[PDB]
């Protein structure tokens, strides 16, 4: 709680003031320490105000309570060589709050206690009540060694710490002073769009996947999606010589993000760039319950998997806004339908609808957002509760017989996922009773996940002038048994692979299957050549397609990727592809 700050002489010791722990921040007044280190056995100054005479150690200003202008307070005066004495008084207004009590030298920084009973200010400097009006921050002195070539930094400050909104702009501002060629990577377009506003005044340029490269020759920062970067690498004839790459929300495990990390890592290793991965949950994360800006109530209890008729009154009785993470769109459809039956206003989020739907979570009003894992990647909600059954679907490449991709599960999420889901709330210092309602244990092992080998399909097909095959980022290499370069395509097969993903909008595995079979982009025969069991279903109907040349054919692909038909947007897109319009 309250600590005496002593100064060591040659053989003596004297009190020079008073400070307050919380934790994990030690608070005192500037003139007491002058920014020097203190130790109970070291505490380093991380935030200071010289004009108002305040300083804090170990983090930002924790004590945000203030005097209500009316009531009594207690100065917990810690006088040197004297016992701690509580003295009650009534402060007055002069605008500055001040006490009329006088204590002798060495008592400066003594806590003035609320009724009852947080600290509302510090005694010292009528005698003024000195109190900060700020939240954090603490202060981000940008370490210049993060800009050295062949250096990769993982910026892993907890969720809400301010990586995106506070540290990233600072770094970009600093990198622009150093005249570095900077690339910023955002997980989704809407998130990038948010970043665009927070980087106001700066020369940032948003880059779309419809353009393969875009060089201005001006001092300019490129902003783009993880996936846009990867797509440009597969298609552009220009090497992008950025010497600083910042990937934000670097926990994203979609194949394009994984491949991007590997390429950025290869670029660091070659010596051509510095790299920064921003995520509280880097590869290998085990902790599902990380630090938050505000206290979280972690509530464990049964959560419905589908529509419910009774026994979950706690879901709908709750009086704030809820973010509910579902394993799939279909599971989301069931949950959303059930909530709307009770007259609840729900917004549904998925990868393909994120761009249109997520903006609405800001400029409309709602009770529930029902989302897939996509909301783990920097999606901000002004909500008080997360419902997290800690469940997801996992794409898996089956080799038992003919090669296909299935969505396995629902299965438990990684610890990293659970943390990012939980991490949606507790982010607001002014709101202290956010809830994380969850069910089940998370699961580390996801070696059978299709995204890692798909990442290698992307990687194996990016060529560098140095002749080096880009490989998975270090911590991620164990997640596939795939051999470096085994997925490398060349000539027309390579070009068709890229095109099937870029314009065809097909998954990586499927695009690779079709292209390496020697099929041209515009040839769609394979969408109808599949066996009996490959018949695609939609809303309980066998899908039939009206082809390019006017034939009515059953949708029955040679290669079966569950992702083209498990996602209703992907099915609609795939039907257009099979038809030859795409």
């Amino acid at each position: 709680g309250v600590y005496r700050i002593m100064q060591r002489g040659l053989f003596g010791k004297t009190q020079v003031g008073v400070g307050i722990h919380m934790e994990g921040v030690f608070h005192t007044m500037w003139h007491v320490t002058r920014g020097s280190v203190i130790c109970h056995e070291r505490l380093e100054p991380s935030w200071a105000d010289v004009r108002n005479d305040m300083i804090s150690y170990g983090g930002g200003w924790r004590l945000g309570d203030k005097w209500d202008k009316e009531e009594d307070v207690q100065v917990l005066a810690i006088e040197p060589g004297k016992n701690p004495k509580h003295v009650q008084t009534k402060p007055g207004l002069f605008e500055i709050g001040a006490v009329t009590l006088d204590f002798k030298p060495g008592t400066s920084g003594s806590p003035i206690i609320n009724k009852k009973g947080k600290v509302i200010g510090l005694y010292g400097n009528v005698s003024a009540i000195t109190q900060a009006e700020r939240i954090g921050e603490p202060d981000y002195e940008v370490d210049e060694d993060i800009f050295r070539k062949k250096r990769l930094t993982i910026m892993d400050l907890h969720p809400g710490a301010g990586k995106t909104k506070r540290i990233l702009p600072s770094i970009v501002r600093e990198a622009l002073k150093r005249r570095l060629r900077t690339l910023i990577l955002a997980p989704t377009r809407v998130v990038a769009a948010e970043m665009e506003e927070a980087l106001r005044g700066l020369p940032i340029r948003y880059q779309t996947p419809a353009v393969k490269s875009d060089h201005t020759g001006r001092e300019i920062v490129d902003l783009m999606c993880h996936a846009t970067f990867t797509t440009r690498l597969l298609s552009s004839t220009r090497v992008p010589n950025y010497n600083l790459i910042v990937m934000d929300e670097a926990h994203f495990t979609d194949p394009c993000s994984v491949a991007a990390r590997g390429y950025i890592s290869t670029r660091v290793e070659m010596g051509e760039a510095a790299a920064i991965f921003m995520t509280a949950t880097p590869p290998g994360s085990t902790d599902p319950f990380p630090q938050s800006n505000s206290p979280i109530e972690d509530i464990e209890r049964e959560i419905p998997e589908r529509s419910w008729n009774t026994g979950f009154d706690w879901i709908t009785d709750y009086q704030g806004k809820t973010v509910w993470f579902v394993p799939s769109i279909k599971a989301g459809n069931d949950i959303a339908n059930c909530l709307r039956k009770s007259g609840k206003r729900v917004i549904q989020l998925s990868r393909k609808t994120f761009d249109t739907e997520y903006p609405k979570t800001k400029l409309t009003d709602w009770d529930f957002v029902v989302t897939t894992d996509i909301s783990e990647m920097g999606a901000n909600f002004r909500a008080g509760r997360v419902i997290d059954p800690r469940r997801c679907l996992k794409p898996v490449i089956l080799t038992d017989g003919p090669e296909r991709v299935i969505l396995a599960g629902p299965i438990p999420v990684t610890p990293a996922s659970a943390a990012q889901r939980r991490g949606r709330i507790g982010r607001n210092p002014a709101q202290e009773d956010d809830q994380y309602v969850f069910s089940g244990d998370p699961l580390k092992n996801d070696e059978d996940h299709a995204h890692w080998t798909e990442a290698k399909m992307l990687l194996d097909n990016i060529y560098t002038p140095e002749g080096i095959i880009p490989t998975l980022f270090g911590p991620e290499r164990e997640k596939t048994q795939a051999i470096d370069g085994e997925f490398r395509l060349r000539g027309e097969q390579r070009k068709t692979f890229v095109e099937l993903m870029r314009r065809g909008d097909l998954p990586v595995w499927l695009s690779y299957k079709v292209a390496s079979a020697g099929i041209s982009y515009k040839d769609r025969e394979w969408c109808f050549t599949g066996e009996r069991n490959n018949q695609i279903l939609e809303e309980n109907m066998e899908v039939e397609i009206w082809t390019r040349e006017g034939e009515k054919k059953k949708l029955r692909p040679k290669w079966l990727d569950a992702r083209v038909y498990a996602d209703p947007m992907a099915l609609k897109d795939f039907k257009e592809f099979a038809s030859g319009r795409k």
Binding site: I5, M6, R8
Partner: peptide
């Protein structure tokens, strides 16, 4: 002129 800390009391009323 090194700086160290010593406990005094806890943050409380009365």
């Amino acid at each position: 002129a090194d700086l160290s800390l010593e406990k005094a009391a806890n943050v409380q009323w009365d």
